[PDB]
Amino acid sequence: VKVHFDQAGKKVSRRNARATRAAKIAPRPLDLLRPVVRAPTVKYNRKVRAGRGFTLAEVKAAGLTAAYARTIGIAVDHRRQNRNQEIFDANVQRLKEYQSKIIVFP
Amino acid sequence: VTSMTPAPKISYKKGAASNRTKFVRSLVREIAGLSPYERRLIDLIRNSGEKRARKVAKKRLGSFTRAKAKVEEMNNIIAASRRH
Amino acid sequence: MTSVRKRKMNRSSVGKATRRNKDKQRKINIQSNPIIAANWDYSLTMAQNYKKLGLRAKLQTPAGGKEADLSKVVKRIPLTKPVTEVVKKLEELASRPVIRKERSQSEREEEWLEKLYKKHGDDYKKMFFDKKLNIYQQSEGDLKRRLLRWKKRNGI
Amino acid sequence: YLWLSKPPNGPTIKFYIQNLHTMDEXXXXXXXXXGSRPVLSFDQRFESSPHYQLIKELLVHNFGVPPXXXXXXXXXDHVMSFSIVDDKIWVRTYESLVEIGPRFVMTVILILEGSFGGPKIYENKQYVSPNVVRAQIKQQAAEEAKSRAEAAVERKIKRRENVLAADPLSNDALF
RNA sequence: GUUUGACCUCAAAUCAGGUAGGAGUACCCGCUGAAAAGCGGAGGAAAAGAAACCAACCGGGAUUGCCUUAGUAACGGCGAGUGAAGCGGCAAAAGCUCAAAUUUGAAAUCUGGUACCUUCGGUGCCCGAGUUGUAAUUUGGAGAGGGCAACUUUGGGGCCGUUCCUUGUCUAUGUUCCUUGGAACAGGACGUCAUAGAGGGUGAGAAUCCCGUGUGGCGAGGAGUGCGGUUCUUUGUAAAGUGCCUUCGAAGAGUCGAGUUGUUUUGCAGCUCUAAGUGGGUGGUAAAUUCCAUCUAAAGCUAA
């Protein structure tokens, strides 16, 4: 037996985390740059979704290295495979738009 | 929704065997000699044929395709030794 | 307050090691850039304050509803009835070139290049197959790169 | 699934298995002498259908027991019965008869040539593999979700297209 | 040479330096286990955790936890009832390190002692450890050697702020008249403050009596690299990254697996047997002498 009495409280604490982390990460977003990825499982195969990370080859197609891209806040998954054209292209456009909107301090 | 061909990632284990590792394994083979059931197994080939040899080897092993490879390996040993 | 420890610590002459924290955990300093530390407000939120900056606070797809906060009046459809600033400051700061230093050359190896420059001159196929003063057997073009850097540094 | 086949020869049949029952429960409640000669009970024609006739033949060759069986000097009244119900062979085991054995509901799938590889010669279309049943379940669920999403779209349309305009004579119309 | 010495092993040290135990034990992790108890081991969390994964799709992508899946699948004298998981939505997000081929143009590595120094350390010197392998480089997402073309990059301190902690101090307005009362903090009349009318005390219900409360301010002592300025230096043929070309291009065995026994509801354990390298694991698939999918086990760490 357990009752979530702290449901109101923990959220507050969580936003405190979402405050406090943000304090350290002051210009940058809290979250990384995640891929837009179409789901499996025919019930959901029309659904698109947030994915974990893009790939090496896609980040190369964006025009940078993944080792550098992790410093730019772009989530990268090696074990994913890019197999759909439109997914790949839309995520490349996403990467380009993310590159357009950042300004990086030396 | 139309196509895109990924570059197929094959593990380096699945590529091939090198000259180095074949040399290593074959050089271990003559040094290690035969285990006693292998000493039995060459004699059992020479005496009662590969039928009973494969059956005894599968009894020593767990499965059957390993017994194939074991009998074929001892045939390779007999071919390497007796003619040469 | 019914453990033996808590009751003894209550009755003790030591006094409770009491520290107050609950007020100061809500407020945070941003610690990182003095520009954002200037424009930070401590009143709006992380979310509202990043929006008032112009920086995208969360990357993508917030769960829940944002504040559309009544910027405009929305009127009913008749259905055809019958008859930046701080962004600019940080953009200047990232656009600001840092005072960088050219990577120079070390004195021994530029002297080595100076020996090569007088021994062979400028040609590279002779100095590539030189034993003395090319004992590390430098690459054909690394020689060119180091000599061009040395010439731009000294001696045209 | 199982195959039973003559390993130098053309016969090869694939049967599906349903509804097993074991020796553990009271459904048996008796043991018999392991090695008695079996009797069969072909509770079906097995004659008019040539492939069922081959099934009956190969079950005779399979389940026929030569006298090299140990403990065969006793006959333990052992009998097994085969019954095509619709196209499913119910197989039962008796020892007056008491069910002393495991229980089958068995289903033909396909017949092919050779010893394990040779070309497919017969197949009953009446069998459905249960993977296809799960696939039907998932496809129907995906169709339901698609219809539910389209209906939610049309509900938001109708909510947008549900608004009735004000009268020209109202206070909000004036002001 | 009956001598002498390398080792190697094993002892001894009131030799030097360290460390183990016990308590507590809500949470965690192992072991044992009835009709829980017990044992062992930790921490502020622990565990788990970067696929020998899940799937069959227009594929997904470490672990963890929540909602849903769902009281479904499945199991069960299919009786009692037992009882999941994929996907989805969310929270949180982070990835890394070994072991395989030579640095052989120089073991480049480290403990310890000592002398100094700016001391959670640094430098020097000397014993040792170590080739029965300590460093650099490389963990498949490859990588390495070169070569070409370019570009692109540099590290270490200080100090002062800032940030964090622990404190210290300052920061409003009636004790105005009358009645009652032992005592006004009660009742009436007239007020003032307020970003302060929370609370408590003061001889009865006190914003205005006191402490506070509220708003801000000034300190003090630490922690600290989080960043922000200054300031001092840092190169030595030093280190790294990207594209192209050329030449190569090595990985977890008493393990995998098999049988049996116990145990659990398929793993685990014991006993016996015991492999492969275009290998192996796992799953669908068949118009069938099938094709295709998907990972790399038997080494390790990792916040939330």
Added chain:
RNA sequence: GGACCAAGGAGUCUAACGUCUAUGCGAGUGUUUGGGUGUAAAACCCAUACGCGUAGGUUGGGGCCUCGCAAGAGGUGCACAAUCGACCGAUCCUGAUGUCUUCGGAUGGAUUUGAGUAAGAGCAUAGCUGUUGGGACCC
């Protein structure tokens, strides 16, 4: 079953189905896992998912209309009921046009069938209650 007296002292809570009633919306309904917000365990706003549901005639007959001063007459007929239908699914025969020699169901029958079609009613919350289980009124 009892010396007296004071105090304490026995159908509570929760879960799953079920009826009824009230309320909101309505073929839809359900904010509160979670996010945003806040004067801060309150209130306020809500993205994507998910849950559950959705996807003919005759006789009457409430009324209503007409006429009738009224009594009554005529007409249209809510709900619902009965009949005769129809159709779908099943049922057992017919077994065509075709037919790979065993495939096929065309047409016509027959009874019942079914919370069947023939123009929805549900979802959510609360209350009172029914059954079951948790110690389950107490000893």
